[PDB]
Design a protein around this ligand. Structure first.
Ligand SMILES: *[C@@H]1O[C@H](CO)[C@@H](O)[C@H](O)[C@H]1NC(C)=O
Length: 218
């Protein structure tokens, strides 16, 4: 189904698609999500138009999976995911990105974390991640520009693809392992609180078509 309501959510089979227009107060416009299928992953599209607040994210329309029991990053053996998407519209300033929070407390509120891991498969316009570039890194055989900085007390690592990656197959465990093995990230003590995929728009008119998104934690 389709909804443009600010906080619309749709759930099925452990997947949830949310409108999540948390930054609407930064501009004029709208955001709508359409669920096509929640069987065999999430197939959905995000539609939006935004003006004003040049450097303010307006929303993070996203699909995510339920995480009934929080586990440490090291205890998890695999976090496989696939994504097939395309972006259309005009004057698109927006990204396409995975978002995950972790925290030392497994009972941490799930709307923030000690750390935020982002994996930007797409980047439209002159926008950029939190922090500064730490250079090019290899994860899963693909090159990423890794950014690191703080959003308040929370530390944010964003792996940004060097080309829009519209068909992706990977394992988020490889990204956490990169941090654990190269940036002192405490995978032994951090629990995965969320596992999301969507788009952060700033301005323009856009449609993100997510033909398929799958993710699980094993
Ligand atoms: C994604 O595509 C847009 C539109 O062609 C382009 O401007 C942008 O540089 C691309 N981003 C990446 C990461 O290649």
């Amino acid at each position: 189904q389709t909804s443009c309501d600010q906080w619309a959510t749709f759930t099925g089979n452990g997947y949830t698609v949310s409108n999540n227009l948390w930054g609407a107060s930064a501009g004029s416009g709208f955001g709508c999500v359409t669920v096509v299928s929640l069987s065999g992953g999430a197939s959905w599209h995000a539609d939006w138009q935004w003006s004003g607040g040049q450097n303010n994210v307006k929303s993070y329309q996203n699909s995510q999976i339920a995480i009934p029991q929080k586990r440490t990053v090291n205890s998890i053996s695999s976090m496989p995911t696939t994504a097939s998407w395309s972006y259309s519209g005009s004057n698109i300033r927006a990204n396409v990105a995975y978002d995950l929070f972790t925290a030392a407390n497994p009972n941490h509120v799930t709307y923030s974390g000690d750390y935020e891991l982002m994996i930007w498969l797409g980047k439209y316009g002159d926008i950029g991640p939190i922090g500064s570039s730490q250079g090019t890194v290899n994860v899963g055989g693909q090159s990423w520009t890794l950014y690191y900085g703080y959003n308040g007390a929370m530390q944010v690592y964003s792996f940004v693809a060097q080309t829009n990656t519209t068909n992706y197959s990977g394992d988020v465990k490889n990204f956490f392992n990169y941090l654990r093995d190269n940036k002192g990230y405490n995978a032994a003590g951090q629990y995965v609180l969320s596992y999301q995929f969507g788009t952060e728009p700033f301005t323009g008119s856009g449609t993100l078509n997510v033909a398929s998104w799958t993710a699980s934690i094993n």
